[PDB]
Structure formats: structure tokens, C-alpha cells
Design a protein around this ligand. Structure first.
Ligand SMILES: O=C(Cc1cccc(Cl)c1)Nc1cncc2ccccc12
Ligand SMILES: [Cl-]
Lengths: 305, 296
């Protein structure tokens, strides 16, 4: 019993964190095999950040300008190349702690663990989700760039995010491990703002099913709804549209608890209308949207209370 | 910017998790040097122990079987002497924590780590964790510099879904016993010094709507705190909140008047750090650490 925001064990990622220094800038890098991956903005000055020409800045650099430190050992850079917004530094030594890994690009609503780092040293681990506006609500200070987001289903580490910047509202933007940004963001100091954010509907439903599994049903009602009527209501509360894919994905949780997806949808509609009336659901007074259907199945018991 | 419930990096602890099997029971063990520590309920525990031999305890570290060469009990923890010292043993200490203190939990099943989360020792000595069958032996810890301080080992779940366990010397936190008997968690209270620390974290991150011009005495604040099931605030708590008070410019008793108004009036449809409840699982040290970037 119980339901916590749970992160994956971070050890496999800790053994990959290194410090990358170029001129005055110091940030984090990800050392896998003989390559160190880091944000390309490590070659910029703060002035350069308005309209940087990365190709022009990179051609002026040599291998010895990049200082890479793994613990107390200085690694030797023997090559460099740019792939989208990521810099790939070829080093003379392969990481003996390299785990089994993949580079995966995730979709909004997906969750992952973040190992926040400073100076190539891990400081903390937390769980979070890719928001519908492609930003993440992280906890990052100056020096955190290059920190990575990942999942470890089975024993393979799936890298999905690398931290690049903080937007004016305090939210964070970054790329997949191939250097492609999530969202319409650029690694430029230009007028950029996160779009209006919405609630991840399929995740709130998954979390309502987790509450039923943990023995709570106060929020349920005798009603049902069509998918269309639910979406007309949900969009008035800034909730993401629920698709037939989302309904299919909630199938196993529906079969385990005995509550049809459109019946759980009717309960969500009523919660949005009435509020919680001094009650909580899994120790929360708000409707939680950072647990996917997959997260609920992984953490919760296979036997409903 | 941002404020998350953050756990310590778990790598140093992952390299210590093993599976312990005795008869029908399978649970987790902590392998440090040549000893495996696990809950004694894996087996009158002295009468139960005398009947077991070394070869009855099967210990597995990854895909390698460890040979048990000795066994002894210390309070509610079983110590299994093994033939091999853990090469991944980090620098460590066994520490007993107080209610209100926080720690990270590496939840394990079959000696394999599955997740990490942050939590606090409640004033009623239980923890609001997330555990299923197979999780016994999972450990709680903090990291200070490069030294792991082990503070908790999981033993059981109470009827309300909350958890109970011991320090690494086998002494239970709370008035609990390791046996299937009528046991219930006592009435819990809110950790006042932690709510204040979290209010300071919100001010540091730009949430100032709850601030007011008023102040209070420590005595008047405690009379109000007793009414809402909040733990008493001591002069030690006031001194501990000193640095956060100097950084934000809000005196501890000035922040207490904000907390008094929040208890009597509610939040009025507003949130603080994305929460509609007053959060009590961040200590003053956790707030300073997350708003400074200390690494390990
Ligand atoms: O935003 C940046 C650097 C930058 C600037 C402009 C464009 C780009 Cl691509 C990168 N750093 C930080 C990343 N996370 C959190 C931060 C919190 C405070 C200060 C800086 C923080
Ligand atoms: Cl995805």
C-alpha cells in the first residue's frame, strides 16, 4: 500500500556524469562508450547567445579547448562534431561504467527521472513529466545544463532528455539525446515563452484508478459519459483532449478495478465541477497528472483493495 | 527555479542490495564489508535462530551466490557473516534519526532496486511509504559528502497502509513489534518547523501572497498550533530557521503569523509551490540544499 512519486534508481546514470569546460563556461556531459554528449551552448558567451552561429563558433575550436573531467581524472578529447543542438566529444577512453542504453524521444504526458548535476557531480534525483506545452517543471539552478532525464524499464537505460535552459516562468526546456528540442524552443537568448499549459487527462484518470486500487472510491458516481461529451467538459477546465488511444491504454486498469473508462471519465467530470470538499485522493488536494497508466501498473499492486 | 521532492542519488546503496531467502521467505539484505543485514522475521527469535544453520540462509548478490559462514542477532536485525567482502562497500555510518527528519528510500524486491523516493519520519514514528510484498529489508539513508548514513530498514505495513521499521542496529522507530498482532499507528501531527521551511522555499521561488505585516509571540503561536494538530515549535526550531529568515528578510515569528492565518482562513483557492495543502516533508536543511545545489 501507498503511492509515492517514485524515480528510477540513479546509479547507472551517476557513473556516466562528467564535467565539460570550454573557456569560462562549465556544465555537465554524458559519457557513454568513447563519446561525451553535452549542450552545444557550452561554446557560447552570454553575448553570443542572442544570435549565435554555432557552426562559425565550432570551426574556431580545437580538441584541446574542451576540458573534460570524470571524477578526479582528466579525459583527452580526440574529436568533436555537432548533431542538432548537442555537441559530441570523442574521447581517448571508453567509460567502463557504460550501462546497456538507448536514446528515445518521448511524447507529452510521458514521465521520466532527472538526475540533477552540477560540475559533473550528481546532487539529486526526482520524477517529472513532459508537459503538453513541451516544457518540464524541474528544479534546476545555474550549472545544471547537461543534466539528463531517463527511464530504466528492465536493466536498459533509456535516455530521453538533456537539460538546456530555463524560461522566464521558471519552467525548463531541453532536447532528446540526438539534439532535437522538445517544443518550439531554440538555444538562443531570444523572446521565448512557454505556451498555455494544460492538464494531462489520461494521467489524471490513471491516478484515479490507482486511488481505487489503494481502497478509495468516494469520488465515483452512478453516471457514464460519451467520449465527445467528456471532451467538451474537460476542455473548459484546460484539460487535454482524451483520444480513443487513451481509452484503449486505460483498458487493463479498467478490467482490474471493474470500472469502465467512460464511467471513470464521469467521475472526473464531477470532480472538476465540485472540487474535493475538504477531502484528499492519495494524500493530495489537487488532481495529479504526473503518473502515466504504465507508472500506475508498475507501482501499484495487482490486487485491488 | 523549481521545487521538487528530491531524493539523494542512490548508486552507493544499489551496490549493497542482495536477496535473502530462508525457507519460504524471500526479502532484501544490505551487504556491507563481510556482513549482510536483514529483518530477523526472515526466520521467540532466539529459539527460532538456534534451529537454523548457516547453509539454510541463501544469499544472492546479482547472479552470484554468497556463502553464509556465521549468524547473530542484534535487536530486530539479523547479521549474516559471509565469505566475501562487498567490493562496492561505500564509506558509511549507522545513524538513528528523530521524527521530522527526512531520508531517501531505495525500494527493492528480490534484491533488485526498483525505485527511489524521499520521505519523512512522522511524529507518530511511521513513514508514509510505497511498498508491496517483497519490500522488507529495503533501506532509508542520507548522504553527507561521500558518506552514506543508513537510518532505516523496512519491516512491516500497518492496517492504515503506513509503514514501520528499525534503525540499522535493529531498534524499532515507535512502539511497534515485529509480529502479527493488533498494532495501530497513533494519531499523527504536522511537522511545524518543516512547513515553515517550505513557506521560506516558496518565498525564495517568488510565492509571496501569504506574507502579512503581522508578527506573533512563540507562546501565542504554540497555543494556535495545538488546536490544528501541529507539533509545538521550540526555540531550537526558531534558531534552525535563522539562515532562511536572514536570506528572505522575514523573521521566523513573522512567518508564524502567516502560518496562523493560513490555518484559520485556508488558502482561498490558491496554491503554494503547486500544492493546495501545507507541505511538511522538507526540513530546513533540505530547503537550503535544494536552493544551493550541494553535490555528492
Ligand atoms: O538558462 C540557462 C542558460 C542559458 C541561457 C540562454 C539560453 C540557453 Cl540555451 C541557456 N541556464 C539555466 C538552466 N536551468 C536553470 C537555471 C536557473 C537559473 C539560471 C540559469 C539556469
Ligand atoms: Cl513516449
Amino acid at each position: 500500500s501507498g503511492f509515492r512519486k517514485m524515480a528510477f534508481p540513479s546509479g547507472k546514470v551517476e557513473g556516466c556524469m562528467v564535467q565539460v569546460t570550454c573557456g569560462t563556461t562549465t556544465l555537465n556531459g554524458l559519457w557513454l562508450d568513447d563519446v561525451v554528449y553535452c549542450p552545444r551552448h557550452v561554446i557560447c558567451t552570454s553575448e553570443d547567445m542572442l544570435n549565435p552561429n554555432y557552426e562559425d563558433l565550432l570551426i574556431r575550436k580545437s580538441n584541446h579547448n574542451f576540458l573534460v573531467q570524470a571524477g578526479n581524472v582528466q579525459l583527452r578529447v580526440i574529436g568533436h562534431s555537432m548533431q542538432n543542438c548537442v555537441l559530441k566529444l570523442k574521447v581517448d577512453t571508453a567509460n567502463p561504467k557504460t550501462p546497456k542504453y538507448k536514446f528515445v524521444r518521448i511524447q507529452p504526458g510521458q514521465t521520466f527521472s532527472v538526475l540533477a548535476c552540477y560540475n559533473g557531480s550528481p546532487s539529486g534525483v526526482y520524477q517529472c513529466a513532459m508537459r503538453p506545452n513541451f516544457t518540464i517543471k524541474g528544479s534546476f539552478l545555474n550549472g545544471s545544463c547537461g543534466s539528463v532525464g531517463f527511464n530504466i524499464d528492465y536493466d536498459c537505460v533509456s535516455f530521453c532528455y538533456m537539460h538546456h535552459m530555463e524560461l522566464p516562468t521558471g519552467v525548463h526546456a531541453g532536447t532528446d539525446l540526438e539534439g532535437n528540442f522538445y517544443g518550439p524552443f531554440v538555444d538562443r537568448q531570444t523572446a521565448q515563452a512557454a505556451g498555455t499549459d494544460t492538464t494531462i487527462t489520461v494521467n489524471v484518470l490513471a491516478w484515479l484508478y490507482a486511488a481505487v486500487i489503494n481502497g478509495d472510491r468516494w469520488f465515483l458516481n452512478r453516471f457514464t459519459t460519451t467520449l465527445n461529451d467528456f471532451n467538451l467538459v474537460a476542455m473548459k477546465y484546460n484539460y487535454e483532449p482524451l483520444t480513443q488511444d487513451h481509452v484503449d491504454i486505460l483498458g487493463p486498469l479498467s478490467a482490474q478495478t471493474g470500472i469502465a473508462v467512460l464511467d471513470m471519465c464521469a467521475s472526473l467530470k464531477e470532480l472538476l465541477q465540485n472540487g474535493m470538499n475538504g477531502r484528499t485522493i492519495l494524500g493530495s488536494a489537487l488532481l495529479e497528472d504526473e503518473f502515466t497508466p504504465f507508472d500506475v501498473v508498475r507501482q501499484c499492486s495487482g490486487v485491488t483493495f
